[PDB]
Amino acid sequence: QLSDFQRNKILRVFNTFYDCNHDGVIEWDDFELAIKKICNLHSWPTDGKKHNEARATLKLIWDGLRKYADENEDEQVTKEEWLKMWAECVKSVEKGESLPEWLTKYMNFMFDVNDTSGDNIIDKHEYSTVYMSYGIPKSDCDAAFDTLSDGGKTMVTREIFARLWTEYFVSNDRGAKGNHLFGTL
Numbered sequence: 001q002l003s004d005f006q007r008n009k010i011l012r013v014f015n016t017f018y019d020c021n022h023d024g025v026i027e028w029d030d031f032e033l034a035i036k037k038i039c040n041l042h043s044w045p046t047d048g049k050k051h052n053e054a055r056a057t058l059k060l061i062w063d064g065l066r067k068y069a070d071e072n073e074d075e076q077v078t079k080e081e082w083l084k085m086w087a088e089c090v091k092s093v094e095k096g097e098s099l100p101e102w103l104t105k106y107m108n109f110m111f112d113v114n115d116t117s118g119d120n121i122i123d124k125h126e127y128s129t130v131y132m133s134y135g136i137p138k139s140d141c142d143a144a145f146d147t148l149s150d151g152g153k154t155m156v157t158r159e160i161f162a163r164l165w166t167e168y169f170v171s172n173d174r175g176a177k178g179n180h181l182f183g184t185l
């Protein structure tokens with residue numbers, strides 16, 4: 001139903017980007033730690049514009065995740081419920097059926113987190129800043145970003161990041177360039 005290459009890809013985003021308190025289950029608590037994190041890193045005025053965008057955007061993502069994975073409606077999402085969902089999404093993308101709104105919010109949230117500069121491109125400096133903070137070493141944020149940017153001849157616009165994003169979550173092709181989007185496997 002789901003190859004290990006995809007499973008393993010799919011749990012990294014869980015254990016490394018969602019379970020921000022490292023307790024086995026995604027819940028809103030994890031989203032607060034993340035909000036705090038990005039708030040600080042990018043030095044946002046604590047209740048100003050970006051911080052509040054980030055918080056009301058992550059309320060939607062939780063609510064989306066909540067609604068599309070929480071089988072028992074217990075306000076927490078286990079890896080089982082997390083894989084169980086992502087399988088549907090893979091079918092979905094493969095079978096044409098596009099992703100639910102909250103996915104496109106998460107996807108673009110990650111982009112906007114990176115693109116502090118505002119120019120709708122992610123230069124290398126922006127990529128290393130974010131993903132190092134997540135505890136990926138710098139010999140990867142630099143390693144991977146060259147896989148993602150093809151040496152730097154390709155600008156990494158919002159569209160490019162979407163393609164890469166997609167390949168990360170659903171491509172079973174263990175040679176696909178987007179498989180390095182969250183670092184190196």
Ligand SMILES: [Ca+2]
Pocket residue numbers: 069070071072073074075076077078081
């Ligand atoms: Ca649950």
Ligand SMILES: [Ca+2]
Pocket residue numbers: 114115116117118119120121122123126
């Ligand atoms: Ca930029």
Ligand SMILES: [Gd]
Pocket residue numbers: 018019020021022023024025026027029030
């Ligand atoms: Gd958690």
